[PDB]
Amino acid sequence: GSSGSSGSIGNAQKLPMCDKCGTGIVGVFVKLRDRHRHPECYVCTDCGTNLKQKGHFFVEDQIYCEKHARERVSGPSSG
Numbered sequence: 141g142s143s144g145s146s147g148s149i150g151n152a153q154k155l156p157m158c159d160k161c162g163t164g165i166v167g168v169f170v171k172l173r174d175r176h177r178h179p180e181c182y183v184c185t186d187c188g189t190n191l192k193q194k195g196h197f198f199v200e201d202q203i204y205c206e207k208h209a210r211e212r213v214s215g216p217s218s219g
């Protein structure tokens with residue numbers, strides 16, 4: 141464990157907090173339409189594949205891989 145993260149600081153430039161985890165992003169990242177995510181979180185939510193090239197889909201306010209997304213957008217409906 142690190143048990144660090146020390147350093148007193150006042151105001152700070154606004155950062156696009158990731159959606160998957162929920163933490164202020166810094167540096168390289170994947171900016172979504174109206175949302176923001178990390179360069180590693182951008183991966184699918186079901187399995188976790190790099191949607192960098194493949195791409196991400198919108199289902200129930202979530203992101204998945206065409207492989208999973210298609211299955212969700214097409215099929216049953218979980219209340």
Ligand SMILES: [Zn+2]
Nearest residue numbers: 158161178181
């Ligand atoms: Zn994240």
Ligand SMILES: [Zn+2]
Nearest residue numbers: 184186187208
């Ligand atoms: Zn998936």
